[PDB]
Structures are given as structure tokens and as C-alpha cells.
Design a protein around this nucleic acid. Structure first.
Length: 17
RNA sequence: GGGCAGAUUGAGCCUGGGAGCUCUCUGCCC
């Protein structure tokens, strides 16, 4: 902990199909 | 598609200072 240079995770994201 | 939670003892980026961003996997919810 006590650090930076990251964000909250995701479920899924966009794609071509 | 999106949110919330878990993997940075998963990958990448910019920056002096992220309540930061891109990218992937899993669970729950819409």
C-alpha cells in the first residue's frame, strides 16, 4: 500500500465484435 | 456496454504534485 501510479480495476471493455 | 469488489507477489503509459489514464483476467450487480 501507501503508493501511486495505478487505478481502480474494470469488468470488461469494448471490442470490434 | 457500464458500475462496484479482488489479482499489479498481472502488462503498459504520462507526470513535479493522480481523487490519474490505457490494457487483460475473475466475482457480484444493472
Amino acid at each position: 500500500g501507501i503508493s501511486y501510479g495505478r487505478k481502480k480495476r474494470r469488468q470488461r471493455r469494448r471490442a470490434h465484435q
